[PDB]
C-alpha cells in the first residue's frame, strides 16, 4: 500500500487541475461571448441610424 496513497493524492491533484482548467476554459468562452454578444449588438443600432437617415 505504498503506491496507493500517493496515487490517490495524484489523482485528486489531477482532478483539481482539470477542475482548475475548466474555469479558465469557461472564462475564455465568456470572453469570446462578450464580443460575440456585442458584434450583433452594434448592427441593431447602425441599421437604426441608417433607417433614420434614409427617411431624410
Amino acid at each position: 500500500s505504498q503506491k496507493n496513497g500517493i496515487a490517490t493524492l495524484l489523482q485528486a491533484e489531477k482532478e483539481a487541475h482539470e477542475i482548475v482548467s475548466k474555469a479558465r476554459k469557461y472564462r475564455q468562452d465568456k470572453l469570446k461571448q462578450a464580443k460575440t454578444d456585442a458584434a450583433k449588438e452594434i448592427d441593431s443600432y447602425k441599421i437604426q441610424k441608417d433607417k433614420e437617415l434614409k427617411e431624410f
Binding site: 500500500s1 496513497g5 490517490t8 493524492l9 489523482q11 485528486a12 491533484e13 482532478e15 483539481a16 487541475h17 477542475i19 482548475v20 475548466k22 474555469a23 479558465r24 469557461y26 472564462r27 475564455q28 465568456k30 470572453l31 461571448q33 462578450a34 464580443k35 454578444d37 456585442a38 458584434a39 449588438e41 452594434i42 443600432y45 447602425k46 441610424k49
Partner: protein, 52 residues
C-alpha cells in the same frame, strides 16, 4: 505509527486538494462572468458614438 491513519489523512488530503481547485475555479468564473459583460458594454459604448 499505525497504518490505519494513513487513509484517514489521505481522505482530507484529497478533500483539501479538491476544495482548493473548486475555490479557485469559482473565483475564476466569478471574474470572467463580470469581465465578459464589461467587455461587451465597452464594445457597445465604443460603437454607439461612432454610429451617431
Amino acid at each position: 505509527l499505525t497504518p490505519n491513519q494513513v487513509n484517514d489523512e489521505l481522505n482530507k488530503m484529497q478533500a483539501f486538494i479538491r476544495k482548493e481547485a473548486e475555490e479557485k475555479a469559482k473565483e475564476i468564473q466569478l471574474k470572467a462572468d463580470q469581465e465578459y459583460e464589461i467587455e461587451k458594454t465597452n464594445i457597445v459604448r465604443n460603437e454607439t458614438n461612432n454610429i451617431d
